[PDB]
Each structure stands twice: as C-alpha cells, then as structure tokens.
C-alpha cells in the first residue's frame, strides 16, 4: 500500500537530502528506552547516558494531504521542545 | 557617605548569546541579615521599568526564571541566561541600604550585539530659505553605525545638540542627528566624528 | 480530443473532465461533482491527483504539469486551461 | 490582579500645579508605601519621593531638588496616591512614574508625559536637506507640543526611515529631522495634530 500512492525507493535506501531521493527506504525495527528524572537515577546509581531536557509533539495542522507535510508546523514543534529545555538553536550542535 | 552602584555601560548582547552584567559597590550591601540588599530593574524603552531580581539573587514572579543572580559582598553579577529579541533595554543598579534613591544609576545600553560598521558621516548645509528666516541648522548626519559611542565636532563646538534612534531590528545599527543651531551673521566663518568604526577622523564640510 | 467542431469543444472537454474526476474520486454517482469546490475539499490528494492528471492526458493527449492541481484547483480552471491550450 | 494606572498629564508654564493620581486596584492599598519617579527623556531616572504606610504612619520623604515643592498623600476609602506638583519649574518635564514600594519598585506605572514648557503651539518649520552630491531629509524646527509623525513618499517609503527622535530647544519648542537614504526628487510630510499646519515638501539639491 505504501507503493500505491508512490512513496517509496526502488532500492530501500532513504536517500535524505540527496538529489536521489525516491522517498522512504522502509525498513523494520525497533527500539526502546529506560527513562528516569536525573536526580532519580542519580541517587539510586542506576547508569546516566543521556539526559532528555525537552520534548514536544506538534500536529501539521491543516497540511497539502495527509501524509503530506507541514513547512510551518516542525519549526513549532522543534521550537517548543527548544522553550520547554530550555535550549536554544545555537546549543544542539547535531540533529538526527 | 554614598554607596557608589554603576553598572558597566556598553553591553552589546546577541540574540542567543549568553551574558553577564556586574555592578561596583563601595560600601558592602551584605547586610547583616545575610541578604543582599541591592535590585535589578529593567526600563524596557517605551514602557515602565520592571522588576527584574531583589535581594542580589531573588527573581520577581511575571518575569522569567531567565534572569538568574547572585553576587559576593561588593561584587554582583546578573547572569542573563540567554538574549531574546524583546530583551532589550536599559538595566539598572538600584541598592537598596540608604533611601533616598534619588539616582537611580546612569544605566546600561543593552544592544542587539553585531559587528563594527562605518558610520555615513554626510555633512548637510542649511536650506538658505532658512537662512532668510531668521535662523540657520547645518546637520552633520550619521547612519548605520555601532556602537554609538562619538559626538560630532563642529570646527572652522558648542551649539550642538543630541539626537539618536534606538536600534531598530533588521538592521540593528543607530543613527545621529548633531543639529547645529546658528545665528544669522556667523554662517560664513566641518564636522567628524571619532567613532571606533574608523580610526581617522573624516573631515567635510559645508 | 474534439477538434474545435463547436462552441461545444468547451462544454464537452468540461464534462470529460467532471467524468475523470467522478472515476478518480470514487464517485459511483458520477452524476454530479461540487464544480466550485476546490482540488482539495474533495479529497483530490496525492494519488486522486497525479491518476486523474494520468487520465487527462491519456484520453486528451497532453502533457499537464507535475503541480496541475495546485496550478487549477478548481474543476472549472483545470478545463478551462485545458481546453485554451489546444496549441 | 494588579494595576497602578495613572492620569493627570497636561501642559503648563513654569510656575503652576498640575495633578497626578495614581489608580490603585487589586490589592489592600494601605500596606505598601507609594512612592513617584520621575524619568527625563531618553535618560536617566530620578526619584522624586514616597509616602510611608498609614500602618506604618512614618512620614514623606522627598528628593533633594523637590523640597518645599512636591507633596505625596493616601487614602485607603478611595484608594488613590497623589502627586502634588507646585512651583513647576523646567525640569519638570519628563515622564513621572508610580511605584510600589519605598525601598522596593515591585511594579511600575505606565507614565504620563508631564511637560514644563514656555513654548506655544504652533505649526513647524520645516526646512529640508539640500544632498552634497547620498541621504535627502527634511527638518521639522520650531513646533510644540510634542506629536509628531513624520513619513516619506507620503507613506509610501519606508525602508531606511530615520525618525530622529525630538530635539530640545532652550526656546521650548522642538525639532525632528527625518531624512531617507537612498540614491535617486522625495516626498516628506510632517502632521502637527494640535495645530492643523500640514506642510507638504520638495526637495532637491
């Protein structure tokens, strides 16, 4: 179904921000996360190795489609989680 | 005698950028309760002051948590976490161990932080429909220079006067109107500036 | 595609296109589709987009843009320009 | 919630009284010591004086230069604070402040514009800049009270405005000096409110 509307790459490589771009390069995974407050994980000795200062979720709105993105809709979102950390766009040094 | 509370003048801040403003203290403000007794006050140009931190180290509530403090017994630092475009203004170094508070401090120019450029020192000779009014204002104009920190000289001084914008936020530089009120005889008988944006002064003149 | 034999060459690409539209939005009562609704308050996205752009230029011969129906976001502007754009 | 709204603005010759009250809301009015700041254009502030808490009783304490001058009162009933000016001088003019504290400016009043001047209102004199060869610009000399708007184009330019701020004569009167820059034959016009003297301006070298 992700073929039928034409998203995806012939190849199964998401070619981000490359002038080959096909679009998704689906693959299957997963991934999971024990989170703890800092001073909660500090007190009990459990490990620290990396600390989430801030988060937030942003709905594209009123976009061009569903699956379609927001341009204005991920600078509040990445600006909300950047005012609720109280971080700033010249403090990350890298963004996945 | 006066405790003497200045604080250091030509602040130049950066949106994003952290900074820090300190104060002088003569006498010590470390009263004897263990509390600071000095404050920080924010005239935000346009509106009224606001009540930034008391105490040396306590923040007030409306404002945010931001603005952090503290100090030593003479020594004071305001620990401006972070400059937003709205953070804009003049800070003050108000104490508080000996009213009256009749001075509250000469201020600190708190500038949107950017690059030395050259000031557009442009001499303007007065129209002569006005020198056949009954008076004459030649204009030594600058533009798009900062810091503000030069006066215009009138050779070939005195009857000058002060004129100068804030910063505006595109372009974020000042610009300075030395208005030369004169007298109708004396028009027959140049101005530069000494701004750190050169280092010679530019000489032209009516 | 009709070659200019009427006045009618308009009416004609426009009820062609209404056809189209009715076949690519799921319409089984291809009878009716809101003429002055625009391309996307009838679900015309991505897909209902690029297949009716297909099928425009497949039964008309032509060759519309990638964003025709961001260009025409009416029924009524999209025959319109494709039945001013016979050469 | 809090709000310190003031009135009492106005126009006057040295030597005169005018009116300040301070509008208080939100809060027992008797407990803190309400105090007035007086702001100098465009520099620094100066505090002119307080009252103590009926509470606390205590008396009016002054600024040095507004002895046997200025007078401060409150009252709980009518919750007002009073700035009473009497033998105005020159310095006069500035913006004075109502403040929430004597030793403690918690909040802050918006201002109002008290102006000490000997000037009349009149229309400006509005003299341009001839360019040396570039910036074109044109004086607004001679003109009071002080709105003022000054635009270029007749608001139709707006990039590399400079509405220089007001000019102090020691006449009481004021000028500005709005000039553009921009390599070229401009409009600028300047509205006296008060006066109703529109003067529309050419200009070239």
């Known amino acids: 179904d992700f073929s039928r509307m034409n998203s995806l790459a012939p190849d199964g490589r998401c070619k981000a921000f490359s002038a080959g771009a096909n679009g998704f390069g689906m693959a299957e995974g997963a991934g999971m996360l024990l989170l703890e407050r800092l001073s909660d994980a500090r007190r009990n000795g459990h490990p620290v190795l990396a600390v989430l200062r801030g988060t937030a979720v942003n709905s594209d709105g009123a976009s061009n489609g569903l699956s379609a993105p927001n341009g204005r809709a991920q600078v509040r979102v990445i600006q909300q989680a950047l005012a609720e950390s109280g971080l700033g766009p010249a403090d990350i040094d890298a963004v996945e | 005698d006066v405790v003497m509370t200045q604080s250091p003048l030509s602040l130049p801040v950066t949106p994003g950028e952290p900074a820090s403003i300190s104060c002088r203290s003569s006498?010590?403000?470390?009263?004897?309760?263990?509390?600071?007794?000095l404050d920080w006050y924010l005239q935000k140009p346009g509106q009224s002051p606001q009540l930034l931190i008391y105490?040396?180290?306590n923040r007030a509530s409306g404002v945010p948590d931001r603005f952090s403090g503290s100090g030593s017994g003479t020594d004071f630092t305001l620990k401006i976490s972070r400059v937003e475009a709205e953070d804009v203004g003049v800070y003050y170094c108000?104490?508080?161990?000996?009213?009256?508070?009749?001075?509250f401090g000469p201020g600190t120019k708190v500038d949107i932080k950017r690059t030395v450029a050259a000031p557009s020192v442009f001499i303007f000779p007065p129209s002569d429909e006005q020198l056949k009014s009954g008076t004459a204002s030649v204009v030594c104009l600058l533009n798009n220079f900062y810091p503000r920190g030069a006066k215009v000289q009138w050779k070939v001084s005195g009857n000058s006067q002060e004129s100068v914008t804030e910063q505006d936020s595109k372009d974020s530089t000042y610009s300075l109107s030395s208005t030369l009120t004169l007298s109708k005889a004396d028009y027959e008988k140049a101005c530069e500036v000494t701004h750190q944006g050169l280092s010679s002064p530019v000489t032209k003149s009516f | 595609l009709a070659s200019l034999p009427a006045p009618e060459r308009e009416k004609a690409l426009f009820e062609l296109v209404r056809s189209h539209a009715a076949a690519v939005l799921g319409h089984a009562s291809a009878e009716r589709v809101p003429a002055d609704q625009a391309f996307a308050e009838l679900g015309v996205d991505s897909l209902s987009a690029l297949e009716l752009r297909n099928r425009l230029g497949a039964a008309t011969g032509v060759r519309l843009p990638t964003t025709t129906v961001f260009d025409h976001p009416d029924v009524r502007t999209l025959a319109a320009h494709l039945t001013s754009e016979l050469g | 919630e809090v709000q310190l709204v003031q009135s009492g603005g106005g126009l006057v010759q040295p030597g005169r009284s005018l009116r300040l009250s301070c509008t208080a809301s939100?809060?027992?009015?008797?407990?803190?010591?309400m105090s007035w700041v007086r702001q100098a254009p465009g520099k620094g502030l100066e505090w002119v004086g307080f009252?103590?808490?009926?509470?606390?009783?205590?008396?009016?304490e002054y600024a040095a230069s507004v002895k046997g001058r200025f007078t401060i009162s409150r009252d709980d009933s009518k919750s007002i604070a009073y700035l009473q000016m009497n033998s105005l001088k020159t310095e006069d003019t500035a913006v004075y402040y109502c403040?929430?504290?004597?030793?403690?400016?918690?909040?802050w009043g918006q201002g109002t514009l008290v102006t000490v001047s000997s000037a009349s209102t009149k229309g400006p004199s509005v003299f341009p800049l001839a360019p040396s060869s570039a910036a074109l610009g044109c004086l607004v000399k001679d003109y009071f009270p002080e709105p003022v708007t000054v635009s270029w184009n007749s608001g139709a330019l707006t990039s590399g405005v400079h509405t220089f701020p007001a000019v102090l004569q020691s006449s009481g009167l004021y000028s500005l000096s709005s000039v553009v820059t921009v390599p070229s034959t401009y409009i600028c016009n300047v509205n006296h409110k008060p006066s109703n003297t529109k003067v529309d301006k050419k200009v070239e070298p």
């Open positions: 939100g809060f027992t009015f008797g407990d803190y010591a």
């Open positions: 105490l040396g180290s």
């Open positions: 006498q010590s403000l470390l009263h004897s309760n263990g509390y600071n007794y």
């Open positions: 009252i103590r808490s009926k509470a606390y009783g205590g008396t009016t």
């Open positions: 108000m104490q508080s161990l000996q009213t009256p508070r009749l001075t």
């Open positions: 403040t929430r504290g004597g030793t403690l400016f918690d909040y």
